[PDB]
Design a protein around this nucleic acid. Structure first.
Ligand SMILES: [Mg+2]
Ligand SMILES: [Mg+2]
Ligand SMILES: [Mg+2]
Ligand SMILES: [Mg+2]
Ligand SMILES: [Mg+2]
Ligand SMILES: [Mg+2]
Ligand SMILES: [Mg+2]
Ligand SMILES: [Mg+2]
Ligand SMILES: [Mg+2]
Ligand SMILES: [Mg+2]
Ligand SMILES: [Mg+2]
Ligand SMILES: [Mg+2]
Ligand SMILES: [Mg+2]
Ligand SMILES: [Mg+2]
Ligand SMILES: [Mg+2]
Ligand SMILES: [Mg+2]
Ligand SMILES: [Mg+2]
Ligand SMILES: [Mg+2]
Ligand SMILES: [Mg+2]
Ligand SMILES: [Mg+2]
Ligand SMILES: [Mg+2]
Ligand SMILES: [Mg+2]
Ligand SMILES: [Mg+2]
Ligand SMILES: [Mg+2]
Ligand SMILES: [Mg+2]
Ligand SMILES: [Mg+2]
Ligand SMILES: [Mg+2]
Ligand SMILES: [Mg+2]
Ligand SMILES: [Mg+2]
Ligand SMILES: [Mg+2]
Ligand SMILES: [Mg+2]
Ligand SMILES: [Mg+2]
Ligand SMILES: [Mg+2]
Ligand SMILES: [Mg+2]
Ligand SMILES: [Mg+2]
Ligand SMILES: [Mg+2]
Ligand SMILES: [Mg+2]
Ligand SMILES: [Mg+2]
Ligand SMILES: [Mg+2]
Ligand SMILES: [Mg+2]
Ligand SMILES: [Mg+2]
Ligand SMILES: [Mg+2]
Ligand SMILES: [Mg+2]
Ligand SMILES: [Mg+2]
Ligand SMILES: [Mg+2]
Ligand SMILES: [Mg+2]
Ligand SMILES: [Mg+2]
Ligand SMILES: [Mg+2]
Ligand SMILES: [Mg+2]
Ligand SMILES: [Mg+2]
Ligand SMILES: [Mg+2]
Ligand SMILES: [Mg+2]
Ligand SMILES: [Mg+2]
Ligand SMILES: [Mg+2]
Ligand SMILES: [Mg+2]
Ligand SMILES: [Mg+2]
Ligand SMILES: [Mg+2]
Ligand SMILES: [Mg+2]
Ligand SMILES: [Mg+2]
Ligand SMILES: [Mg+2]
Ligand SMILES: [Mg+2]
Ligand SMILES: [Mg+2]
Ligand SMILES: [Mg+2]
Ligand SMILES: [Mg+2]
Ligand SMILES: [Mg+2]
Ligand SMILES: [Mg+2]
Ligand SMILES: [Mg+2]
Ligand SMILES: [Mg+2]
Ligand SMILES: [Mg+2]
Ligand SMILES: [Mg+2]
Ligand SMILES: [Mg+2]
Ligand SMILES: [Mg+2]
Ligand SMILES: [Mg+2]
Ligand SMILES: [Mg+2]
Ligand SMILES: [Mg+2]
Ligand SMILES: [Mg+2]
Ligand SMILES: [Mg+2]
Ligand SMILES: [Mg+2]
Ligand SMILES: [Mg+2]
Ligand SMILES: [Mg+2]
Ligand SMILES: [Mg+2]
Ligand SMILES: [Mg+2]
Ligand SMILES: [Mg+2]
Ligand SMILES: [Mg+2]
Ligand SMILES: [Mg+2]
Ligand SMILES: [Mg+2]
Lengths: 118, 113, 54, 214, 122
RNA sequence: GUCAGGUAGAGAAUACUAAGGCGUACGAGUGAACUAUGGUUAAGGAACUCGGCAAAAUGCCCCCGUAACUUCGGGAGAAG
RNA sequence: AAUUCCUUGUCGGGUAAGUUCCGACCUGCACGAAUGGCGUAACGACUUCUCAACUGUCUCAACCAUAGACUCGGCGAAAU
RNA sequence: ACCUCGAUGUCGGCUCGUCGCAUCCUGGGGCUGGAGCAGGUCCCAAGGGUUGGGCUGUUCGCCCAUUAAAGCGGCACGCGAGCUGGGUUUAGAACGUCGUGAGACAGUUCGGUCUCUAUCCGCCGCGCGCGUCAGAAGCUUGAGGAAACCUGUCCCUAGUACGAGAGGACCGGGACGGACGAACCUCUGGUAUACCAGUUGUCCCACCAGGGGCACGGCUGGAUAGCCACGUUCGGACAGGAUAACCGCUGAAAGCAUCUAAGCGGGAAACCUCUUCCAAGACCAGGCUUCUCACCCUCUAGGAGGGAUAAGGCCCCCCGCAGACCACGGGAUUGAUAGACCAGACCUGGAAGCCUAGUAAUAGGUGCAGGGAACUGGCACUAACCGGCCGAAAACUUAC
């Protein structure tokens, strides 16, 4: 999606990419994670485009998501559960809710989860 | 959609043939020589097409008396009255800038099948 | 550069005054049937039980 | 009299004249304006016409503004400005309620366009004031983009108010003047001006007649 | 778009075959010279048998430049090498023959002789 | 001071890796100026400057071919 | 002249323009023969002059990223 | 030899200026041994402008190509808590000269560390508080300031005035520029760290195929948005007032005369309006107008204190091409504010899988394919919430 406007999230351009990939893997694995608020705001669109890849079932889309994610259990669970689960939801698969600030650095925290209503 | 479409649909030109970079064309430009309208033909190879709709432009390259020449036109320019596609080229790029650095038989284009 | 003169108490207390904190604006939520106060930022997260009301 | 209208800057494109020359144009939506008030010397101290542009929901209108529009008799609009006129014979032809569109202007009409320029943030003296930089090599030490001298020694002993330094840039009223109206699309409520207009896209501009070239 | 201390291929048969710019004429403090802009130059290398010998300070006009030039109708003319012809103070070439194509802007700068003399005009 | 995996490689160089070992002790943000460290740059190409400082550039292997001068070894990886 | 104040000496070369440079001239303020004199191939992170190539050194600067600066939480100095 | 030796850093260049006028250009004139063209000299005029190189450490200066012109000066010979470090002024070495020597030389040559987190005034921007006799909001007037002002060539007038000839205008018109500035991103061009493609090395995804991590985004070829100049557009005006030098009119004192003494005029890039921008904390704190225009309690009834409110705003929330933070602007379910989704524009250049041809590397088809950020339009799917905090009036006097 649209790039980061300011300095990249993990401290460099390459760290932000792998950081997003790990965050998306954990979100798809557990269905809910708690991270910082900017990381969660960056992870929402990036994860939703992978979910869009999983919603439409083709070998080409599976290859694109394997390109980006690199975890085969998570790819299987995407295309077996999450894609079919969202066959009638048109976008907006995730949900960011703000939670209490961290203690060590007082970092604004947040939680991303997958919508389970329809 | 594409806000200024309603101001640009009016001046868009018909009768512009489909042509891609790599194509050999001759472009007929109408030119005034002391208010006397003559027609001058630039026969070359299309090396790019910068996308804009009404502001669409295309660049033609031609080797003339030992010096290369680039002529850049707006696709919907009304000085252009006619574009003839003579042959079709086989390229793998959208912008054949390397032709400015190659001279002669190495400035050749594969003939499209 | 280096301070030329020791700075006076009025001028010291003038911009020590700006180093203050502001109290967060709280609103009420009802959890487990009893009322608590939480920032409006954390209102939803309290309403679905993701902030630890001690 | 100095006619004018409020509108928005849609964008900019190009056209070709009859003699086949490309003309860069900025496109402005000079959408409808209702005049909401007259200013007169007998009452206000000067002659001017207050007119309103835009589309706004009445839910979003604050009660004083809604009341000021009710006293006029017109539905509220987002933006309100006014034209300074010169005399009362000029404001004889404006009445509270009536309309004015892009058809006030014509082909070849020179207009002055007032807008608000784009924000450039906190800018340094090279960007802001066109300062010459300093050397990139030959020994220059951490001064490749700094202003350097800002006065003289011990006389005057200060820095002469008005010295060009670095700070917030942009976001200012700008009037570009003697800009040709290439073509008024009368039916579509648009007018195409030869040149550039200050501000971002979808920003409020005031297109007035030109005083230097009227 | 030619600076001072820019080198231009001479494009007529005066005998010179390279020049270096000394000044751009047409105004005080001028910088660049596109097609049609007369410059003063020093001949940097010439055929030894010619009339225009090396080191001679001459007056030349640019006829083709590498940098693109916008035209009034929205079109552009761009060449692959910078070239000038050595002219007189009378605004006409010293040589008897122009080599290579020449940009069309010389016709509205009243370089009638050159435009007549170049094999084909762009 | 000792030991010295793989693949490119002349190599104990360099790139990536195995075993093994780390992520080393303030963080979270954020497109300000400015400083530092990297990158790219139309046209021109030393016009900069005390001075081509700094950058850019050449760079490897194999064939061909190499000057004035020389103390007859060289110069020489000349240059190309 | 690593030596010449006078001096930017004189003549030629080199540049579009030559107080440096090169080759000479001799009026050597104030060279000169083991505090050696005059040459000399090879060598030099030496000093000086030049050409080619190359370039953000420059015309004339623009943009991108990272570390600071900047904001939030923790700790928390200094010369004066 | 007056301050400074318990420290006032020294030349030239860079950056950035600022003022004078003793004017270099541009503007206005008087006299000429001024025919015209072009000058000489003096007077008035400081608004703007006043180039790039070679030689030299250079200032100075010599020269080269221009230019309307390439002004001279003050500001610690402006400016090193802004830069440099070629010069000069440590320590090394050498030449020449002086000295028995150690050494020395307003003699030369080669080398030779330029520190500092800004307290206060000053200056460039940005907020918080109170005030402008109720509390708010929209639009404004402008006192007072700041910005800007440059200029050439060609052509008509006119080969005319003038002149023997060569030569050749005043005045008034018309066209195009140079430098500078501002806004802008349609075009050109640059850049592109979550775009696309090719590709080398190595490791990995079991393997094939297809991909990924790392090597400056590994390198390479392009590249929409945004920022931008090398690009696009526009500007300096017109007119008026009062004048400088200068030119006068009518005119005494002084029967004639004189621009002056009484009075009346012409008169320049300088001054005042004019153009652009800031502007009511302009304390004479302004004007036009709209909205709310109310609800209690205590102290002891005189004034005060507290509280709940209206109109309105602020925070929280969703954002922005607005931005250091703050501020600013927009949205907040009566909703398209941002993300996703769908479509389009655009960028790359023809995905994967299959089939086929060839021993193969590979090529063709399916097929303007696949991928994809910023731009546009749809779409409440996801978040903009079952919300808190602020915030409204003594009277008196005269006139009416
Ligand atoms: Mg970015
Ligand atoms: Mg940054
Ligand atoms: Mg950080
Ligand atoms: Mg990397
Ligand atoms: Mg295209
Ligand atoms: Mg610079
Ligand atoms: Mg330093
Ligand atoms: Mg540096
Ligand atoms: Mg100082
Ligand atoms: Mg003072
Ligand atoms: Mg090894
Ligand atoms: Mg190693
Ligand atoms: Mg391990
Ligand atoms: Mg910041
Ligand atoms: Mg850099
Ligand atoms: Mg370049
Ligand atoms: Mg280039
Ligand atoms: Mg050179
Ligand atoms: Mg130089
Ligand atoms: Mg040189
Ligand atoms: Mg110089
Ligand atoms: Mg170097
Ligand atoms: Mg290098
Ligand atoms: Mg050889
Ligand atoms: Mg040799
Ligand atoms: Mg070799
Ligand atoms: Mg010497
Ligand atoms: Mg001597
Ligand atoms: Mg000498
Ligand atoms: Mg000489
Ligand atoms: Mg010599
Ligand atoms: Mg001895
Ligand atoms: Mg001796
Ligand atoms: Mg002896
Ligand atoms: Mg010896
Ligand atoms: Mg010798
Ligand atoms: Mg020798
Ligand atoms: Mg040695
Ligand atoms: Mg050394
Ligand atoms: Mg610039
Ligand atoms: Mg940082
Ligand atoms: Mg802190
Ligand atoms: Mg005494
Ligand atoms: Mg004293
Ligand atoms: Mg002292
Ligand atoms: Mg002291
Ligand atoms: Mg001191
Ligand atoms: Mg002291
Ligand atoms: Mg100064
Ligand atoms: Mg004077
Ligand atoms: Mg003057
Ligand atoms: Mg004069
Ligand atoms: Mg005179
Ligand atoms: Mg003025
Ligand atoms: Mg020198
Ligand atoms: Mg001065
Ligand atoms: Mg000084
Ligand atoms: Mg000075
Ligand atoms: Mg200094
Ligand atoms: Mg210093
Ligand atoms: Mg030194
Ligand atoms: Mg010594
Ligand atoms: Mg002795
Ligand atoms: Mg005023
Ligand atoms: Mg600007
Ligand atoms: Mg665009
Ligand atoms: Mg581009
Ligand atoms: Mg990618
Ligand atoms: Mg696999
Ligand atoms: Mg494979
Ligand atoms: Mg790889
Ligand atoms: Mg690894
Ligand atoms: Mg790339
Ligand atoms: Mg590129
Ligand atoms: Mg940009
Ligand atoms: Mg009389
Ligand atoms: Mg008289
Ligand atoms: Mg004041
Ligand atoms: Mg007020
Ligand atoms: Mg409110
Ligand atoms: Mg708001
Ligand atoms: Mg799309
Ligand atoms: Mg394919
Ligand atoms: Mg959209
Ligand atoms: Mg209250
Ligand atoms: Mg009172």
């Amino acid at each position: 999606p649209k790039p980061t406007k300011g300095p990249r999230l993990g401290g460099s351009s390459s760290h932000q990419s792998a950081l997003l990939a790990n965050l998306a893997t954990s979100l798809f694995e557990h269905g809910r994670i708690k991270t910082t608020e900017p990381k969660a705001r960056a992870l929402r669109p990036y994860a939703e485009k992978l979910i869009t890849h999983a919603k439409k079932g083709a070998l080409h889309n599976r290859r694109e998501v394997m390109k980006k994610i690199r975890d085969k259990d998570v790819v299987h669970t995407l295309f077996a559960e999450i894609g079919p689960f969202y066959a009638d939801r048109n976008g907006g698969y995730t949900r960011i809710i703000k939670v209490e600030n961290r203690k060590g650095d007082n970092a604004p925290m947040a939680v991303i989860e997958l919508v389970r209503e329809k | 959609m594409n806000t200024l479409d309603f101001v640009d649909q009016a001046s868009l030109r018909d009768d512009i043939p489909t042509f891609s970079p790599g194509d050999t064309v001759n472009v007929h430009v109408k030119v005034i020589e002391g208010s006397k309208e003559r027609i001058q033909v630039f026969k070359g190879v299309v090396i790019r097409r910068q996308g804009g709709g009404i502001s669409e432009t295309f660049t033609v390259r031609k080797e003339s008396y030992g010096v290369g020449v680039e002529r850049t036109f707006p696709v919907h320019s009304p000085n252009i009255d006619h574009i003839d596609v003579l042959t079709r080229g086989d390229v793998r790029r959208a912008k054949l800038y390397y032709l400015r650095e190659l001279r002669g038989k190495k400035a050749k284009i594969k003939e499209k099948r | 550069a280096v301070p030329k003169r020791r700075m006076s108490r009025a001028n010291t207390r003038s911009r020590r005054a700006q180093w203050k904190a502001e109290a967060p604006g709280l609103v009420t939520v009802s959890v487990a049937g009893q009322q608590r106060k939480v920032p409006r930022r954390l209102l939803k997260a309290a309403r679905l039980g993701l902030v630890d009301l001690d | 009299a100095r006619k004018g209208i409020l509108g928005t800057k849609l964008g900019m494109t190009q056209v070709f004249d009859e003699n086949n020359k490309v003309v860069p144009v900025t496109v402005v939506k000079a959408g409808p304006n209702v005049v909401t008030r007259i200013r007169t010397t007998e009452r206000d101290g000067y002659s001017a016409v207050q007119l309103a542009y835009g589309e706004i929901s009445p839910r979003k209108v604050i009660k004083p503004v809604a009341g000021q529009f009710a006293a006029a008799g017109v539905n509220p609009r987002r933006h309100v400005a006014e034209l300074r006129l010169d005399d009362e014979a000029a404001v004889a032809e404006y009445e509270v309620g009536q309309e004015l569109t892009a058809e006030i202007f014509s082909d070849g009409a020179y207009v002055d366009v007032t807008g608000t320029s784009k924000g450039k943030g906190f800018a340094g003296t090279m960007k802001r004031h066109g300062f010459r930089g300093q050397g990139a090599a030959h020994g220059a030490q951490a001064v490749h983009r700094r202003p350097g001298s800002i006065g003289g020694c011990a006389t005057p002993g200060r820095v002469f108010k008005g010295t060009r330094m670095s700070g917030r840039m942009g976001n200012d009223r700008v009037t570009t003047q003697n800009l040709k109206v290439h073509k008024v699309d009368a039916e579509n409520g648009v007018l195409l001006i030869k040149g550039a207009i200050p501000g971002r896209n979808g920003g409020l501009v005031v297109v007035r007649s030109a005083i230097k070239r009227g | 778009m030619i600076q001072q201390e820019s080198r231009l291929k001479v494009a007529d048969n005066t005998g010179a075959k390279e020049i270096l710019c000394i000044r751009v004429l047409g105004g005080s403090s001028r910088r660049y010279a596109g097609i049609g802009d007369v410059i003063v130059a020093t001949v940097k290398d010439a055929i030894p048998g010619g009339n225009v010998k090396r080191g001679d300070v001459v007056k030349a006009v640019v006829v083709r430049t590498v940098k693109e030039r916008r035209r009034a109708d929205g079109s552009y003319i761009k060449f692959d090498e910078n070239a000038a012809v050595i002219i007189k103070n009378d605004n006409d070439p010293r040589g008897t023959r122009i080599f290579g194509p020449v940009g069309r802007e010389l016709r509205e700068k009243k370089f009638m002789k050159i435009v007549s003399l170049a094999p084909e005009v762009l």
